[PDB]
């Protein structure tokens, strides 16, 4: 549930 | 346990796309649906429905509307993509997205096939967002290659996107994101839809003759 905002990947689960 | 589509769109896809021009969502549909999509795509492939994607590109492709017999889960994927774009509620850049392509189901049939560096929409044809879903169970680029390498304009570093199972990717289709598919050494499948900006598409910069 954590987006590292300098990145462009997130797991939906 | 999966983030709801509306929250995913507004809280991640919109800010990521406006900041980076690229946005990956992993674990988009889950294992059961990803696998069903795989089965449907392998069925299309195995029954000989693909044609040459074209050297510039070594993929084989077919276009899917979503209602064809045997393509029900691909249709579910397409409606799930459309739902995300609708939830984005006009916040992706300044585009007015009102349409899209059919789904392009593509296979790079190993053997070092790929796609040379290119821009999806370099001539103003209306496509503003590229949306790709990867369905390759247990793909590991260390063994099988097939990375999508994006070269975002204004940035010094490139972005490597492995074609991982159940991975959804968005990126601006215009000259901001030249990209290449590196040589693939196993069967690599992906499904792409492109979304259209209403005004750009209506400018008819491209006339298709037949
Ligand atoms: O399959 C991919 O990762 C990328 N595909 C493309 O760049 C394309 O078909 O235009
Ligand atoms: Mn492309």
Residue numbers in the entry:
A (entry chain B): 1 to 13
B (entry chain A): 186 to 239, 250 to 405
Quote the study's own text.
The degradation of HIFα subunits is promoted by post-translational hydroxylation of prolyl-residues located in its N/C-terminal oxygen dependent degradation domains (NODD and CODD). These dioxygen-sensitive reactions are catalysed by 2-oxoglutarate (2OG) and Fe(II) dependent prolyl hydroxylases (PHD 1–3 in humans). The human PHDs catalyse hydroxylation of prolyl-residues within the N/C terminal ODDs of HIF-1/2/3α and are negative regulators of the transcriptionally regulated hypoxic response.
We successfully crystallized cPHD2 in the presence of a 14-residue NCCP (3C), obtained in a RaPID with five rounds of screening. Consistent with the reported NMR studies, we obtained multiple crystal structures revealing that 3C binds in the region of cPHD2 immediately to the N-terminal side of the core distorted double stranded β-helix (DSBH) fold of PHD2. Binding of 3C at the interface of two symmetry related PHD2 monomers likely promotes contacts productive for crystallization in part via projecting part of the C-terminal helix α4 (aa 400–404) away from the active site, in a manner that maintains interactions with substrates that are required for catalysis. In the cPHD2.3C complex structures, 3C adopts a rectangular fold comprising two (almost) planar distorted β-strands connected by two type II beta turns with DY1, D6, W8 and T13 at its four corners; most of the side chains do not protrude extensively. 3C forms extensive backbone-to-backbone interactions with cPHD2 β1 (aa 204–214) and three residues located at the N-terminus (187–189) within the same cPHD2 monomer and six residues (399–404) located at the C-terminus of a symmetry related cPHD2 molecule. In addition, there are backbone to side-chain polar interactions between L188PHD2 and F213PHD2 with R123C, and A399PHD2 with T53C, as well as side-chain to side-chain electrostatic/H-bond interactions of D212PHD2 with T133C and S113C, and of K186PHD2 with YD13C.
